[PDB]
Design a protein around this nucleic acid. Structure first.
Lengths: 79, 628, 449
RNA sequence: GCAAAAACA
C-alpha cells in the first residue's frame, strides 16, 4: 500500500505558498494522487466514516426536492 | 473518389483538376526547424555508401565516388568524376548555338550587369546587425563595409563588387563604422553561414521543408552563375523553361512502334547533389569553349564557398521532461543526430557534401540535362528542378526498358536518384504529367497550383481592380479557366472588391454618399460593374465614358492633375490613394531626401538606369546647366 | 583576380583545388541495373483502424440550421432571440463546460443593447483560455519529474466515420432560396452572353442546395470574425451569423465570440466561442461540443457551444470560401461546352448521364446531381484541409493518371522499388475525408480488361 | 482548446 498522503508517510505536498490548499485537491492537480485512488478515498459510502442515521439532502430543481438516505463523510481519513 | 472518375463524355484527366485542395488554408510550419535542418544535413551522408555508414562519411570532402558503389536499389549521394566529365563533354558537343550564345553572354554582357540588382532579392541575415534585414539594406550595409575596410571605391559593375569581396577577404582585420570589428576567420565563417528558415505556403506534401539563403557577400557570385545557367537553359530544348510539353505532344510516331512516356519526380533532390559535380560541369564547359582563367575562378568560387556551408540549425531540438518542453542545441544531450555533433560550430553546423533548396535551382537542372545527353538515350527529355517527363521512341519493349534503366543509372551517376514510387511509365505514349500540366493524347491541360486570390490586392481601388482583372485574364489565357469559370471568378472578385471598399450594405462611406447626394459612379463606389468577360482588359474609367456611364464633368472632377491624393494600366485619379531598438528608421528617411531630389531633376532615371560616371556634389553640374 | 590565403580558405574543405583538373579519363561506366516491373493490380489503399474521427471543423456544416426572425437589423434579431428564449443544457462536454452559456447570453444581451464589445466576466476565464499558458507552465514546473528526453510526437490514427456519407447526402438537400447572390457583370458581346448564361445556369443548379447555404454561413461568419481580429483588444466581441431570406426575415445561424486575442504574429491563434444552431446531436461526432436546448416561440432548436482558437490566416482563407464554386463550375462548363463542340449547338440545358462507380457498380446519373455532389465533396475537402489532405491529393494524382491509362487500354510500368501506394498511405492518418476518398478509390475495380 | 512532428493560448 503506497502512502500517497502526508499522514500515510508520503512526501509533503504542501509548500510555503500552498498552506491554504487542501491536500487531496493539490495532490490530484499535481498528479500525485491518481483518479482510481481518488474514487476510493472520497467515497461517500465508505464504512470508516459511515453515519449511524440517514441524512436529508437537497435536490436543486427536482420534482422531489428532499431525499433522505444513508451518508458517510467523504474522506476515509476523517474517522 | 469514385465521383472524381467519370466513365462517359469526359475523361479523368480533365477532372483531375478536382484533385486539388483549393480554397483551403495552406499548411503552415510551426516551431523549430532544427530537426528538419538536421535531417536535411544528415540525409546525404546516409546515402553515400550502399551500406549506411554515417560516421565514415563525415570526412569525405570531395564527393566523388567509384562505380560498383552507387546505390542502385535506393538513394545515392555523390557523383562519378569520369561520368561527369564524359556527360559534360557530350552536352557541350551538342547544342552548339546555346554554347555560342553563352559565350556571347560571358564575353559581352557579363561585365555589364549593375550590382544594384542584388537589392531585389530575398531576406538576408546581416553579418553586422546579427539579424535579418531586407536585401537593399543588406546591400547598402555591405558596400559601406567594403568602402570602409578596402578604401577603393566600388564601380557600378558587379565584377567590381566581386573583386572587392575577394580583396577584402585577404585582410587579417576589418572594422565597420557602431565601430565593431571582425576577424578574418569570423568574416569567413559568416560568409559560410547559411540562414535557414521554414518554407511557408507550400502545398502538395505532408512534411514541411526548410530553405536556405546565402550571405550578401557570396550572393554576387551566386547571381552570376545562376544568370549564366538561366541563359544557357533558355536555349536548350530539354530544359523546363520556354510550351515544351505541348511541342512534344504535337509529335507523330511510327505506325507500329513502342512509344513510351515516363513521368516522375526526384526524391531527396537537394539531399543527393554535391557542388563539386557542378564545379566539374562548369569547368568543362568553360575550358572547351575557350574562356580565360579569371573566368574560371569567377565561375568556380560560388561552389567553392558552398562546399563549406555553415547552415544555421534553427533554434534547437525539443526536449520534454514531464509536461515541460525545452529547446536544447545539438550536442547538449544525446539524440538521433549525434553523428553531427563533431561538426557543430557555435550555433551553426558544417556539412561538406549536400545541398539546400533556394540556392541553385538552375545548375542542378543543368547537371540533370548533361546526364541526359548520351548515346543509347534516343528519346526526348524535359527537366525542371525535381520534376521531369521523358518520351521513349524505340522499336522494342526491351529496348525501352533498357533505355529507362540506363536513364535511371545515368541520373544516379551524378546523384539525382529519381523516386521509384513517383515515377510512372506508360508503354504507349499519350498520358503523362509534368510540372502541374497534364497530358492526354493531343491535348495538354494546364492546372494551377493556386487559384486566383479573387480579392483586391490592397493598394487602391483602381489598382486593385486592374490587378484582379489582369490576374483573371492571365488565368483564363493559360487554359486554366474558361468562359463560365472566368465570369464566375470575376463576379466573386467584384463582390469581394465592393465589400472591402465599403460599397456593400450600410456603412460610413455609403451613408456619406447618400446624405450628400453623391451618386456612386464607379465600381468601388457601389455602381453596377461595367467590366465584362470580353472587356476585362479595359480600364474602368475609359470604358465608362464610351458607354455614357461617366459624365465628362465627372471626368474633369476626378482626373484633375491638381488633386490632393496621387501591369498597372490604370489612369491616375482621386481614387489613386496610398493607405497610411531598430535604429534604422532615421536613415531610410534621409535616403528619402536623396530619392526625393531625384525624379524631380532627372526625367532620365525614369527611363533608364543612373549611368553617370563619378557624380558623388557633382549634381550641381546639372542645376547650373538648367539655369544656363 | 584571386588572393593567396583566400585560395587556402577555399581549398581547406575540398580535395580539388580552385580550378579542378581531374586526371581520370572521361568515361561512363557500365553499371548493372534492376528490371522494370509491370502491375496488373491497381494499388489497394490500407484503411486505418481505430476510433472514428470526430467532426473537426470551424463550423458545423451539415448540421446547420437557422432561426427565422422578424425582419429588421442585426440588433433587432439579437434582441428578439435574447428576449424570447430560454436555455437549458442537454449534453455537457468536459472540453466545453456548460458555464460558457453565461458568456454567450451576456454577449447576446450586450449586442442587443447596442454594444458589440463587452467587458469581461468571470465565466470568460474558462471560455477563451485566459492565463492558460501560465497555468499549464506553472503546473508542469511544479509536477515535473524524471529526466529530459526527445519530444517524439505522435499522431493518433482514426478510422472513417459513418457521418461522412451522411454529410455528403445531407448537403444535397434542396432548398427554397437561392443562397448565392452574385451581382451580374455587364454584357456587350454574344460570347459574354454565353459566359453569363453558363454562370447563371450553374448558380441555379447548385444554389438551391444545403451546401450553398452552409458556404454562405461560413463566409459570413469568417468575414465578421476576421474584420475584428485586426484591432488589438482585451474585451469580448460578438459577431452574429445572420442572413436574410428573400422576404426580409432574419435567419440566425449562430454567434461567434472573440476573446481578448492579443495577437502578434499572423499565424497566431485567436480565442473563439462559437454558438451554432444544430439540427441533430451526436456524441461521437461532436464530443467537444456542448449542446443546449433552445425555446423560441414554442419551437424546438438545438444550440451547440464549442471552445476553439483559430488563426488569422485560416479565418481570412475561410472568408473567401466562395471560391470553392470554381472547380464544380469548371467541370460543368467543360461538359456543357464539349456537348456544344460536338454539334455546334450551345443548348445550355444539356444534362448528360454521367457514368460512375456506385456501391461497386457501374451506373449512370444526371450531370446536375453530379455537379452538386462534386461541390459538396469539394466543400468538405476545403474545410478539412491539412498536410494529410495535401499529401494525399498530390500522391493520388499519379494513381488517378494510372487508372485513366489502364481504362484507356494502356500498360503501366514501374521501377524496381516502386510502390506508389506507400506515399498515399503515409498521408492517411486521421482525416475523415481523406479516409472517405480512400474508401471511394478502394470501392472501384482494380482490374481493367 | 486550436493545431500536428511544435507554435498560439
Amino acid at each position: 500500500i503506497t502512502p500517497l498522503l502526508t499522514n500515510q508517510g508520503a512526501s509533503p505536498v504542501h509548500s510555503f505558498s500552498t498552506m491554504h490548499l487542501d491536500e487531496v485537491a493539490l495532490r490530484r492537480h499535481l498528479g500525485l494522487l491518481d483518479e482510481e485512488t481518488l474514487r476510493r478515498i472520497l467515497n461517500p459510502n465508505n464504512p470508516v466514516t459511515q453515519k449511524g442515521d440517514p441524512s436529508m439532502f437537497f435536490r436543486i430543481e427536482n420534482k422531489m426536492p428532499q431525499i433522505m438516505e444513508d451518508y458517510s463523510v467523504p474522506s476515509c481519513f476523517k474517522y | 473518389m469514385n465521383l472524381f472518375t467519370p466513365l462517359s463524355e469526359i475523361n479523368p484527366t480533365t477532372t483531375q483538376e478536382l484533385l486539388y485542395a483549393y480554397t483551403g488554408p495552406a499548411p503552415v510550419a510551426y516551431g523549430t526547424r532544427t530537426r528538419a535542418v538536421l535531417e536535411n544535413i544528415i540525409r546525404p551522408y546516409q546515402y553515400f555508401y550502399k551500406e549506411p555508414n554515417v560516421q565514415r562519411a563525415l570526412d569525405i570532402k570531395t564527393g566523388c565516388k567509384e562505380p560498383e558503389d552507387i546505390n542502385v536499389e535506393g538513394p545515392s549521394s555523390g557523383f562519378h568524376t569520369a561520368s561527369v566529365l564524359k556527360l559534360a563533354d557530350n552536352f557541350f558537343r551538342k547544342y552548339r548555338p546555346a554554347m555560342e550564345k553563352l559565350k556571347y553572354w560571358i564575353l559581352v554582357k557579363l561585365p555589364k550587369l549593375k550590382y544594384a540588382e542584388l537589392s531585389k532579392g530575398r531576406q538576408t541575415y546581416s553579418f553586422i546587425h546579427k539579424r535579418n534585414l531586407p536585401a537593399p539594406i543588406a546591400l547598402e550595409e555591405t558596400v559601406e563595409f567594403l568602402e570602409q575596410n578596402l578604401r577603393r571605391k566600388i564601380g557600378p559593375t558587379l565584377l567590381s563588387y566581386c573583386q572587392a569581396i575577394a580583396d577584402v577577404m585577404e585582410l587579417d582585420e576589418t572594422t565597420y563604422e557602431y565601430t565593431i570589428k571582425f576577424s578574418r576567420e569570423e568574416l569567413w565563417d559568416q560568409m559560410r553561414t547559411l540562414n535557414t528558415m521554414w518554407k511557408h505556403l507550400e502545398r502538395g506534401r505532408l512534411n514541411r521543408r526548410t530553405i536556405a539563403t546565402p550571405s550578401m557577400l557570396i550572393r554576387g557570385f551566386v547571381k552570376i552563375v545562376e544568370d549564366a545557367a538561366k541563359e544557357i537553359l533558355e536555349n536548350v530544348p530539354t530544359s523546363g523553361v520556354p510550351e515544351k510539353l505541348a511541342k512534344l505532344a504535337s509529335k507523330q510516331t511510327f505506325h507500329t512502334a513502342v512509344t513510351g512516356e515516363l513521368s516522375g519526380d526526384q526524391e531527396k533532390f537537394n539531399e543527393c547533389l554535391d557542388p563539386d559535380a557542378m564545379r566539374l560541369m562548369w569547368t568543362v564547359f568553360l575550358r572547351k569553349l575557350g574562356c580565360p582563367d579569371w573566368i574560371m575562378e569567377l565561375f568556380n568560387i560560388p561552389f567553392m564557398v558552398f562546399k563549406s556551408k555553415l547552415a544555421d540549425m534553427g533554434e534547437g531540438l525539443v526536449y520534454t521532461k514531464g509536461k515541460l518542453t525545452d529547446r536544447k542545441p545539438l550536442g547538449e544531450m544525446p539524440s538521433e543526430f549525434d553523428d553531427l555533433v563533431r561538426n557543430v560550430v557555435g550555433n551553426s553546423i558544417s556539412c561538406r557534401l549536400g545541398m539546400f533548396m533556394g540556392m541553385y535551382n538552375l545548375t542542378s537542372t543543368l547537371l540533370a540535362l548533361i546526364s541526359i545527353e548520351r548515346e543509347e538515350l534516343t528519346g526526348s527529355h524535359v527537366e525542371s528542378s525535381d520534376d521531369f517527363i521523358h518520351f521513349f521512341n524505340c522499336k522494342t519493349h526491351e529496348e525501352m526498358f533498357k533505355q529507362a534503366e540506363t536513364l535511371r543509372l545515368t541520373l544516379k551517376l551524378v546523384g539525382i536518384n529519381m523516386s521509384p514510387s513517383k515515377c510512372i511509365l506508360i508503354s504507349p505514349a499519350g498520358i503523362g504529367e509534368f510540372n502541374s500540366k497534364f497530358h492526354h493524347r493531343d491535348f495538354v491541360g494546364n492546372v494551377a497550383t493556386e487559384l486566383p486570390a479573387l480579392v483586391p490586392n490592397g493598394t487602391n481601388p483602381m489598382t486593385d481592380l486592374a490587378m484582379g482583372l489582369n490576374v483573371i485574364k492571365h488565368s483564363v489565357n493559360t487554359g486554366q479557366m474558361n468562359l463560365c469559370t472566368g465570369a464566375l471568378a470575376m463576379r466573386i472578385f467584384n463582390h469581394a472588391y465592393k465589400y472591402a471598399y465599403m460599397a456593400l450594405g450600410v456603412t460610413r462611406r455609403t451613408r456619406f454618399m447618400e446624405e450628400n447626394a453623391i451618386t456612386p459612379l464607379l465600381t468601388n463606389q457601389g455602381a453596377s460593374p461595367v467590366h465584362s468577360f470580353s472587356t476585362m482588359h479595359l480600364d474602368e474609367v475609359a470604358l465608362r465614358r464610351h458607354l455614357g456611364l461617366l459624365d465628362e464633368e465627372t471626368l474633369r472632377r476626378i482626373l484633375n492633375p491638381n488633386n490632393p491624393v496621387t501591369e498597372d494600366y490604370s489612369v491616375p485619379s482621386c481614387f489613386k490613394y496610398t493607405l497610411s531598438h531598430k535604429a534604422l528608421l532615421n536613415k531610410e528617411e534621409r535616403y528619402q531626401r536623396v530619392t526625393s531630389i531625384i525624379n524631380k531633376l532627372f526625367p532620365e532615371v525614369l527611363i533608364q538606369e543612373a549611368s553617370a560616371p563619378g557624380t558623388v556634389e557633382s549634381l550641381k553640374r546639372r542645376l547650373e546647366l538648367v539655369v544656363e | 583576380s584571386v588572393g593567396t590565403t583566400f585560395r587556402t580558405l577555399l581549398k581547406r574543405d575540398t580535395d580539388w583545388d580552385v580550378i579542378p583538373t581531374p586526371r581520370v579519363e572521361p568515361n561512363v561506366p557500365r553499371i548493372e541495373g534492376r528490371r522494370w516491373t509491370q502491375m496488373k493490380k491497381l494499388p489497394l489503399l490500407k484503411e486505418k483502424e481505430g476510433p472514428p474521427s470526430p467532426w473537426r471543423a470551424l463550423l458545423l456544416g451539415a448540421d446547420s440550421e437557422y432561426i427565422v426572425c422578424p425582419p429588421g437589423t442585426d440588433q433587432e434579431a439579437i434582441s428578439w432571440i435574447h428576449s424570447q428564449s430560454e436555455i437549458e443544457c442537454i449534453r455537457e462536454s468536459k472540453s466545453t463546460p456548460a458555464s460558457v452559456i453565461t458568456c454567450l447570453t451576456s454577449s447576446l444581451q450586450s449586442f442587443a443593447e447596442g454594444n458589440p464589445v463587452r467587458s469581461r466576466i468571470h465565466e470568460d476565464i474558462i471560455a477563451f483560455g485566459i492565463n492558460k499558458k501560465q497555468e499549464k507552465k506553472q503546473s508542469a514546473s511544479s509536477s515535473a519529474s524524471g529526466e529530459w528526453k526527445r519530444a517524439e510526437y505522435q499522431v493518433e490514427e482514426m478510422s472513417l466515420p459513418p457521418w461522412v456519407e451522411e454529410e455528403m447526402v445531407l448537403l444535397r438537400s434542396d432548398q427554397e432560396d437561392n443562397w448565392i447572390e452574385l451581382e451580374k457583370n455587364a454584357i456587350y458581346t454574344e460570347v459574354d452572353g454565353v459566359a453569363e448564361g453558363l454562370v447563371d445556369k450553374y448558380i441555379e443548379i447548385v444554389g438551391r442546395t444545403k451546401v450553398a447555404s452552409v458556404i454562405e454561413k461560413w463566409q459570413i461568419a469568417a468575414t465578421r470574425t476576421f474584420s475584428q481580429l485586426h484591432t488589438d483588444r482585451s474585451r469580448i466581441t460578438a459577431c452574429p451569423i445572420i442572413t436574410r431570406d428573400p422576404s426580409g426575415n432574419c435567419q440566425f445561424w449562430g454567434m461567434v465570440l472573440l476573446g481578448p486575442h492579443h495577437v502578434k504574429r499572423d499565424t497566431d491563434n485567436a480565442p473563439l466561442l462559437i454558438a451554432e444552431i444544430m439540427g441533430e446531436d451526436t456524441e461521437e461526432k461532436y464530443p467537444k461540443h456542448s449542446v443546449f436546448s433552445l425555446k423560441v416561440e414554442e419551437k424546438q432548436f438545438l444550440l451547440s457551444l464549442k471552445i476553439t482558437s483559430f488563426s488569422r490566416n485560416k479565418l481570412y482563407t475561410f472568408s473567401n470560401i466562395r471560391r470553392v464554386l470554381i472547380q464544380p463550375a469548371s467541370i460543368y462548363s467543360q461538359v456543357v461546352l464539349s456537348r456544344a463542340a460536338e454539334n455546334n449547338s450551345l443548348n445550355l440545358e444539356v444534362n448528360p448521364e454521367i457514368q460512375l462507380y456506385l456501391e461497386g457498380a457501374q451506373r449512370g446519373m444526371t450531370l446536375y446531381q453530379w455537379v452538386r455532389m462534386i461541390l459538396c465533396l469539394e466543400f468538405l475537402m476545403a474545410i478539412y484541409n491539412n498536410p494529410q489532405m495535401e499529401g494525399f491529393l498530390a500522391n493520388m494524382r499519379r494513381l488517378h493518371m494510372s487508372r485513366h491509362a489502364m481504362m484507356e487500354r494502356r500498360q503501366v510500368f514501374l521501377p524496381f522499388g516502386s510502390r506508389p501506394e506507400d506515399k498515399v498511405n503515409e498521408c492517411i492518418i486521421n482525416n475523415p475525408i481523406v479516409a472517405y476518398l480512400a474508401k471511394g478509390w478502394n470501392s472501384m475495380p482494380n482490374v481493367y480488361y
